[model samples]
Target: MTIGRAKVYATLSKIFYHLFYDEAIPKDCREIIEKFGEIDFNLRSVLVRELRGSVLIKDMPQSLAEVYESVMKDFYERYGFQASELHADHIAVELAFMSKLVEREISLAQQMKEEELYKIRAAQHRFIKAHLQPLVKNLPSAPLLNFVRDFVREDAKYLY
Candidate 1:
């Protein structure tokens, strides 16, 4: 069956929607893929092809050129490379909400029965320490994971 670009974009929007609000990050991306069928929602794909070369996190559906530029800027900011470039696969961690979900999931070392908020907060904190903190060791004081997470969260609020 042949699908048009409009329909594909519709599906992409739905995928983005789920990624924005869903707790089960991978599950959300998986559902979009299952329903929309994989059409390369890779953030890097969108970034490079759509964004070209610009900074200051922009919206989606941009030209790959535009997205690429934006990502190149971010890569420099995070990795300090003149031109590192991103692979579509590399962004899976952010697009699927893996980073933020992990950010929200660093659990308490020892379970405390009566604590719910603390457990959740603790989980995020630990995920930060164990998962996100390492990016700094690699030179990214502000990882793309953080940028993508913030962009998704902030952008989702404006969705129509």
Candidate 2:
């Protein structure tokens, strides 16, 4: 179950990264969406527009930057220097970071490292509350965005 959870996070991270940064859905994302047998919705407008964490937090870009900087520092300290150069507060970046956390959690769980697992779980909950929740709240209504909002909300419940 934990491994499956990690895969979900990783896949969603890729989907979001390509959608927000590349402004085009990757084949993997397209396939996943199609596998669900859902109606096709036009995402062109949502994809073309900017999606930034700063927008939801009002004018406090610096504060948000500091928050994300600390997150990256923790990530780097734990997983080494393996991350993109994108701004830390980008939606895709945060999701990707969560994916990493879940992967780490899986490793810890496999080793029966209860204490470390607790810390990782706590970090996941905190990250969702601080970053993803707010971003989802302010996102314009769209099929993909709604899915993201619902996914994050449900994940938060699971983490708690």
Candidate 3:
């Protein structure tokens, strides 16, 4: 059976949510994030918080903040999530925002609301370019398993 776009968006959102907070993540995603590298939520939160101080987030346009605020409000209100409990700087929060955008896109698509779809797609593209792309580019490359031993000889760098 063919499902509407909304279901697809919901699934994608769920996956991101699990990545951000779920301890018992499924194999495929777990293998990619856990087996290949070791990073727990506490460590991820530390890294995410640290990254927020970098230039990428600070110089973003005012519009991006507005979008996040709107999405954050919707998500928080729906799940009874208090704003004080979550920070926009966290990866889970960012992914949740993307999930929110996808949810909106799916809503527009399902209703066959063509006019609004353009705006939603534009928002998604703008967000990816300004936020996700920069974050992805800045991620440090990890060496092969053999090279992991070589790293020990260096000044004890934390590459993971």
Candidate 4:
């Protein structure tokens, strides 16, 4: 598929949107995900169960999970280190961060600011590689989280 900026942002936004809210997801996204043949299960439950497996547990010292947490903490510090509801290990929070970066990239792309656009694009790539890609692939429940796995893989094609 041709990865236009708008298409990429829409897909990323919907996945991130679903990553957070159980309701108000775009209808197309819901149907498309359902088509992936997830078991008779709640999407949110799958997301919550699988997200933690990708981080909080498995390996510690040498894991991609550890790197993701460290990277997230760095962002938390960079962004004022404010008290917030979101935790560093939460996949939804990670998706939210990616969503924010993509939104800013869309803005820069609109303004034809090539340098800033490229910077954000590269940042998105780095963030995906460091967090999303590694986390998804290393999940103990990776097969069960195929829906998320596919989403991350597809999203990477656009940003990277």
Highest-scoring model, lDDT: 2
Better lDDT candidate (1, 2): 2
TM-score per prediction, in order, is: 0.24, 0.78, 0.47, 0.63
Worst 10 residues of 2 by lDDT: 39-48
User: Candidate 3, which ten residues in sequence have the lowest lDDT sum?
Assistant: 151-160
How would the candidate models be sorted by lDDT, starting from the highest? 2, 4, 3, 1
Q: Which ten residues in a row have the lowest lDDT in candidate 1?
A: 1-10
- Identify the leading candidate in terms of TM-score: 2
Candidate 1 residue-wise lDDT, 118-160, digit = tens: 5544543443343223322222122333433443343333221
Rate residue 152 of model 2 by lDDT.
84
Q: Which runs of model 4 end up more than 4 angstroms from their true locations? A: 1-50, 53-57, 62-70, 76-84, 140-144
Q: What is the lDDT of residue 45 in candidate 2?
A: 37
Off by over 4 Å in 1: 1-91, 94-114, 136-160
Each candidate's number of clashing pairs is 29, 0, 0, 0
Instruction: Tell me how candidate 3 scores on lDDT.
Output: 0.45
lDDT of 2 by residue, 36-143 (tens): 556343555354235656655564567655675566556556744355765566666777778888888888988999999998899889878877788777778877
lDDT of 3 at 125: 60
lDDT of 2: 0.70
Clash tally for model 4: 0
On the 0 to 100 scale, the lDDT of residue 155 in model 4 is: 75
The segments of candidate 3 whose C-alpha lies over 4 angstroms from its true place after superposition are 1-84, 142-160
lDDT of 4 by residue, 43-79 (tens): 5644553564245445545566547656677865664
Which clashing pairs does model 3 show?
none
